[PDB]
Amino acid sequence: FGAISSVLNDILSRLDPPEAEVQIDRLITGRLQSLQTYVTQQLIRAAEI
Amino acid sequence: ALDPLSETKCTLKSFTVEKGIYQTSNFRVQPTESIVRFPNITNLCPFGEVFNATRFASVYAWNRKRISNCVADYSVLYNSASFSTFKCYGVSPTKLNDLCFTNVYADSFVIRGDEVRQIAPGQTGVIADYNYKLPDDFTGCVIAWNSNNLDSKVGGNYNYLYRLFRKSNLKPFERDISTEIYQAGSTPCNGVEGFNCYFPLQSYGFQPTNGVGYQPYRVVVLSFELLHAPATVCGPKKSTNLVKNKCVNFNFNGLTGTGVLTESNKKFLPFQQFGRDIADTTDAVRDPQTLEILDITPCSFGGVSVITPGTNTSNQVAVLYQDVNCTEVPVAT
Amino acid sequence: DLCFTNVYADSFVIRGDEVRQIAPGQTGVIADYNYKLPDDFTGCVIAW
Amino acid sequence: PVSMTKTSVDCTMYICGDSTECSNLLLQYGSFCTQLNRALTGIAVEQDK
Amino acid sequence: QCVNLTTRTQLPPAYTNSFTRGVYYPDKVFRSSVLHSTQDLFLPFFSNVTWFHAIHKRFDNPVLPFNDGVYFASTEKSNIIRGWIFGTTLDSKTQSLLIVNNATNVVIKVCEFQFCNDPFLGVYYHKNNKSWMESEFRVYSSANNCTFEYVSQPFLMDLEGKQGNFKNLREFVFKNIDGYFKIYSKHTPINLVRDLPQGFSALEPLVDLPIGINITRFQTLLALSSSGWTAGAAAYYVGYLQPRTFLLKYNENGTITDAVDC
Amino acid sequence: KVTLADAGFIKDLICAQKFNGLTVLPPLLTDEMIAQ
């Protein structure tokens, strides 16, 4: 999602948290948005069933 | 955190709970102990062979030394006060004491004082366009400090020199040796010298009573690459013993994680070191002291639901541990 | 034109070119052995 | 067709897998995961119905 | 020292097809039973590649351009291929790479060399002692500055062999990325005569070098008084790489088994 | 005729789905009460 790596334990063990907040925020945004897309699609399929 | 009934209250944000079953927060086996595995590298790194060199190369002929197969300590160079600036980019200098690297490159040269701003990656200017360029995803550190007393002479040690004129910009980690003459005019020039036929190199006026911003500074760059190779140069951490089938914290060459290490059937080819999942999580890892392949599985977890009648009736509850044999509940977040 | 509960004034003397290290979030000699500022610092740093 | 498979998602294991700093940054986003858990619970009840 | 050998037939070059060749392991990360999409330089399938050969008469070692890496192969008996040259101007202005896989050692040098018209190797032919012993090392005359050197262990490979149908089948990929000269290889016994084998094989990562130079040309070293000589029957194939997305298949055993030129 | 999947029993892609917060709740009605 635009950060330097996709593994969270990489970022925790490479930076100290005052700038690791920037990377982790990008990951949180990306994963939360993907999860929201999934639950919306499952809602529509539930209505059809 | 007292009992499941208060847990149900907490997640519904009410003092009252109605009849039914509610799914709640989940459980997890805690890791019990910590395991650190590092290779058997013993000897120390020749930093003084870089920093206490008698001669430093010119910036257009910058010297690179490849440091490998030694156990460094970056704190002992880190906490010295003599450095004018110590700025890193791919990492932060606190973690450098316990992260292990596969090969380290040390670049050294000399520069005029007020263009250390131009040694930073992503900037442009004179030095960044004709003498030394860093790539934009640079992962390392830049150390710089003035050395006016040792190299600058009152006559002027003019063997330090740099390129002025150049045909084009050069790529990262490119270096040119060239005595060709340059044509700043439109007309081509041949032979040696003429009108607007320029020799591309020029020497600094390094003389010691010069003002600041003209001072000679020594610049050292460390440009290690990260965590994807059989490593050589680690940080000074001592190794622990190897524990299997317990929830542990493992630290394999800087790979940090929590789980259970197990004997594997995964028959690695020898040039490999690691192993990933679909979801990009490490699951198979090679111990750097015994060449065996260890499977990594995170510990047990699962669903916790609470069954209650109404609190108007009574305050006794019951628990459903979802999708597990019963026996993991006695050891148990 | 704000108002504050109490104001804390810290004073000392350092070597001149480590005033970069008095900034919060940085590390180095002064930031690790003599004076450390927290990351969510509010206030001002004046140096001359 | 009559029903579909009852699926449940847990955020804090999905998004911030076994990190404390990640979850402490996550509670700044409020109560999204309560809504997502609520929606999947609604679907899971509706299947049995 | 060298001798200008011209005792040979002149022929037009041969063009062949690169059917299902030119893929390697993209990094050293183990994966299993999965399909994986990647982007790197690869050799496109069914592309036009060049066939060179030495028989009996025929001995052709031209200097060829080096862009974006090379897919090399060679089918051979009697172990005639031994060395390779790489560089950009080759006349003592830029450093050059030399590899010699002769009978004794594996000698890899990165030196400021100076070659001539016809740099090559050679052995005498079966002079009643049942042996082809080394007699011709006429490659370079000067070496000014040399950064990397390596001589491997001494050994003794076989320097004889007579089959009209070649069995030794060597495949290599050479690449220069980040000043890093990357050697991928495979060897196969094959029942083949005069062409490329129809089939597929993964190219394992073997060797990395931190040379840091720019190479635009190369030359190949094959084994052989001044004229009057015998060259062993062998062929080799040259092809050129291209940045193309691929889809790769990892089996249970973590072997790259199948590929999609996308 | 119908090939189902993802049983997900405690100890595949199903195991990988299990190790990331994705769980499958079993149905309320079994396969015999429906037949009854």
Side-chain angles (χ1 to χ4, degrees):
Chain A
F1 293 98
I4 74 168
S5 293
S6 67
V7 184
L8 188 59
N9 287 303
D10 191 6
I11 302 299
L12 268 298
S13 67
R14 185 178 293 171
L15 304 178
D16 50 351
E19 69 275 16
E21 286 179 15
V22 192
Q23 315 293 316
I24 288 170
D25 182 75
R26 218 85 62 75
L27 276 296
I28 300 307
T29 284
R31 285 171 184 187
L32 187 67
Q33 191 269 330
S34 181
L35 188 60
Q36 212 83 356
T37 311
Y38 169 69
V39 57
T40 300
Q41 192 170 4
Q42 280 289 112
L43 271 165
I44 306 180
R45 269 184 215 137
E48 164 59 19
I49 296 299
Chain B
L2 184 78
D3 46 28
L5 181 57
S6 284
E7 180 67 37
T8 307
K9 287 183 181 172
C10 202
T11 179
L12 295 179
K13 298 198 169 189
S14 172
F15 290 86
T16 62
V17 179
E18 291 85 3
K19 194 189 177 183
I21 171 168
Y22 305 95
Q23 183 186 1
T24 187
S25 178
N26 310 68
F27 81 106
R28 201 147 54 202
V29 193
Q30 303 294 334
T32 73
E33 55 200 1
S34 86
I35 298 304
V36 167
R37 298 290 271 159
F38 266 48
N40 262 331
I41 316 297
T42 60
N43 46 5
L44 271 66
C45 298
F47 289 155
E49 280 77 355
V50 177
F51 291 93
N52 289 346
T54 69
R55 269 279 311 171
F56 272 28
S58 77
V59 70
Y60 84 101
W62 43 271
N63 186 29
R64 161 169 285 198
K65 184 210 200 309
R66 180 216 164 205
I67 302 183
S68 197
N69 283 328
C70 57
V71 174
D73 189 310
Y74 303 140
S75 63
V76 305
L77 61 83
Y78 184 44
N79 305 323
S80 293
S82 187
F83 290 133
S84 175
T85 187
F86 187 90
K87 149 171 68 72
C88 296
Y89 284 100
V91 288
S92 66
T94 307
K95 306 264 177 173
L96 268 295
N97 209 2
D98 56 351
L99 188 60
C100 189
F101 296 151
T102 187
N103 50 347
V104 191
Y105 274 126
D107 302 353
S108 55
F109 43 85
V110 68
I111 204 61
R112 186 180 68 189
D114 53 351
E115 305 88 338
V116 294
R117 190 264 310 160
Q118 320 190 153
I119 206 73
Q123 279 77 16
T124 59
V126 175
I127 310 302
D129 279 16
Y130 303 135
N131 297 291
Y132 189 63
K133 181 65 184 171
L134 212 52
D136 287 327
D137 45 359
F138 175 67
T139 61
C141 294
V142 182
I143 320 168
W145 80 106
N146 65 301
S147 170
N148 195 5
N149 44 10
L150 188 153
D151 59 0
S152 178
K153 198 173 74 67
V154 65
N157 199 338
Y158 301 137
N159 214 25
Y160 292 150
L161 74 168
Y162 73 106
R163 185 174 314 245
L164 287 173
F165 288 167
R166 182 170 163 80
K167 310 306 290 321
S168 171
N169 289 320
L170 73 165
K171 283 186 287 295
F173 290 140
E174 274 275 4
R175 69 206 306 262
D176 277 8
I177 192 66
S178 59
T179 61
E180 295 175 351
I181 203 82
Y182 187 64
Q183 281 68 245
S186 314
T187 176
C189 199
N190 296 321
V192 175
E193 192 273 332
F195 182 73
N196 69 33
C197 315
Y198 292 101
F199 187 72
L201 311 181
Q202 195 270 332
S203 183
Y204 290 105
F206 279 148
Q207 57 90 30
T209 191
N210 204 335
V212 65
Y214 277 71
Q215 302 293 319
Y217 282 52
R218 303 195 165 203
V219 173
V220 181
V221 188
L222 305 172
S223 178
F224 38 77
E225 58 190 4
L226 290 171
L227 269 294
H228 64 279
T232 68
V233 174
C234 288
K237 307 299 291 294
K238 59 185 67 60
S239 299
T240 61
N241 304 280
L242 185 80
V243 187
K244 295 178 212 165
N245 301 70
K246 279 73 176 175
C247 286
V248 298
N249 303 322
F250 52 89
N251 197 333
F252 279 92
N253 295 348
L255 276 79
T256 313
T258 298
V260 165
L261 310 184
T262 310
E263 294 292 326
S264 58
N265 56 356
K266 298 187 177 176
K267 40 182 71 173
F268 266 44
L269 295 174
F271 45 86
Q272 296 147 348
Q273 302 279 106
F274 290 118
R276 296 178 181 272
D277 291 330
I278 299 165
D280 195 28
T281 55
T282 75
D283 69 325
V285 74
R286 168 173 273 157
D287 192 309
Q289 283 179 354
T290 176
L291 298 179
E292 52 167 334
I293 303 308
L294 315 167
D295 274 359
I296 306 189
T297 311
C299 298
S300 279
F301 59 94
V304 173
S305 300
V306 288
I307 297 169
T308 187
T311 64
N312 278 35
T313 308
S314 62
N315 280 38
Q316 202 183 318
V317 298
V319 189
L320 172 64
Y321 282 80
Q322 155 185 306
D323 195 10
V324 71
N325 188 212
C326 283
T327 68
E328 206 57 31
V329 185
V331 307
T333 299
Chain C
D1 53 354
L2 277 296
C3 289
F4 313 97
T5 314
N6 45 45
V7 176
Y8 274 117
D10 300 356
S11 52
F12 43 86
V13 165
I14 61 163
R15 202 218 319 276
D17 57 353
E18 292 85 1
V19 298
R20 190 259 322 155
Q21 313 186 8
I22 204 73
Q26 281 76 15
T27 46
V29 178
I30 311 301
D32 278 15
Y33 302 133
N34 310 264
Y35 189 64
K36 180 67 183 170
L37 210 52
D39 72 342
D40 46 1
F41 173 70
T42 187
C44 294
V45 170
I46 319 168
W48 79 106
Chain D
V2 164
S3 68
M4 66 182 179
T5 55
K6 296 160 71 172
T7 310
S8 175
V9 189
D10 173 43
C11 285
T12 313
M13 182 175 338
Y14 176 76
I15 301 188
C16 293
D18 291 331
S19 173
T20 306
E21 309 92 348
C22 196
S23 298
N24 293 346
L25 197 149
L26 177 64
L27 281 71
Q28 299 187 302
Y29 273 72
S31 65
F32 278 75
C33 285
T34 63
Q35 278 71 241
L36 307 177
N37 202 337
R38 186 214 288 275
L40 276 297
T41 309
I43 290 174
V45 164
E46 189 70 25
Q47 296 318 291
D48 290 325
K49 182 170 170 57
Chain E
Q1 57 174 0
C2 50
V3 180
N4 282 251
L5 272 70
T6 55
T7 315
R8 58 190 179 178
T9 300
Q10 187 172 1
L11 284 174
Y15 285 170
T16 55
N17 198 37
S18 67
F19 309 95
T20 61
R21 306 291 182 185
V23 71
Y24 43 82
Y25 284 78
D27 53 358
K28 300 191 216 57
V29 178
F30 179 78
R31 295 190 171 102
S32 55
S33 291
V34 65
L35 270 67
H36 191 243
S37 68
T38 179
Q39 163 183 31
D40 191 16
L41 272 283
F42 296 96
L43 178 60
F45 284 166
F46 308 102
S47 66
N48 199 1
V49 287
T50 317
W51 169 15
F52 295 143
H53 49 275
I55 49 171
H56 208 311
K57 181 74 189 60
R58 288 307 312 119
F59 183 84
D60 192 71
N61 280 14
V63 169
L64 294 174
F66 190 92
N67 62 6
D68 289 336
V70 62
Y71 176 82
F72 178 89
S74 180
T75 179
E76 190 158 303
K77 212 74 171 156
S78 172
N79 294 316
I80 317 296
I81 193 66
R82 290 160 194 185
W84 293 272
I85 312 176
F86 308 92
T88 179
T89 58
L90 278 297
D91 198 0
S92 296
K93 305 164 313 296
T94 315
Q95 294 185 1
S96 62
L97 182 62
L98 182 62
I99 170 172
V100 174
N101 305 340
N102 52 2
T104 316
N105 314 98
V106 172
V107 185
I108 307 187
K109 316 208 84 151
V110 185
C111 303
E112 193 69 35
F113 274 126
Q114 185 254 330
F115 308 102
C116 71
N117 299 350
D118 289 308
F120 72 111
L121 300 177
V123 290
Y124 273 139
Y125 44 101
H126 63 78
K127 302 300 289 185
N128 310 85
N129 48 10
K130 302 189 56 50
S131 64
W132 291 28
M133 72 305 297
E134 200 275 334
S135 75
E136 161 78 21
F137 191 67
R138 292 172 145 76
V139 179
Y140 64 98
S141 296
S142 296
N144 204 335
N145 193 2
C146 191
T147 63
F148 201 97
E149 191 273 336
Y150 173 57
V151 165
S152 186
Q153 73 283 347
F155 50 85
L156 184 62
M157 271 185 201
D158 199 1
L159 271 73
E160 291 181 353
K162 275 84 176 175
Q163 283 190 356
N165 276 352
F166 316 140
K167 269 198 155 202
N168 198 303
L169 189 72
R170 291 282 181 173
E171 289 84 357
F172 300 93
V173 175
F174 305 141
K175 189 61 193 73
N176 266 314
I177 296 188
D178 197 70
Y180 287 160
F181 183 76
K182 317 220 187 182
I183 297 89
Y184 307 82
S185 174
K186 186 94 170 201
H187 175 248
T188 306
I190 205 61
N191 296 319
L192 213 51
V193 190
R194 207 177 60 247
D195 55 353
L196 186 74
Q198 188 82 352
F200 181 78
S201 177
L203 292 170
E204 280 75 7
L206 207 71
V207 189
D208 189 3
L209 269 298
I211 62 170
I213 60 177
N214 181 23
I215 300 173
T216 69
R217 303 296 301 271
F218 63 95
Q219 195 267 3
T220 307
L221 308 166
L222 199 64
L224 174 139
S225 199
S226 298
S227 174
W229 47 265
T230 60
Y236 71 92
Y237 296 143
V238 176
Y240 300 90
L241 279 298
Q242 201 70 253
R244 210 79 60 65
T245 314
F246 261 62
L247 183 65
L248 295 171
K249 167 188 222 169
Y250 292 81
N251 55 1
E252 293 90 6
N253 207 0
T255 300
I256 296 184
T257 315
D258 282 319
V260 173
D261 200 347
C262 184
Chain F
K1 283 303 295 165
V2 169
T3 60
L4 61 84
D6 62 17
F9 302 133
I10 193 66
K11 276 75 68 179
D12 270 24
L13 73 164
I14 307 106
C15 302
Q17 287 159 357
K18 205 261 182 167
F19 288 124
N20 287 319
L22 301 173
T23 58
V24 176
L25 298 147
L28 174 70
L29 284 173
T30 74
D31 284 353
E32 294 91 51
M33 294 183 286
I34 294 187
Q36 282 201 231

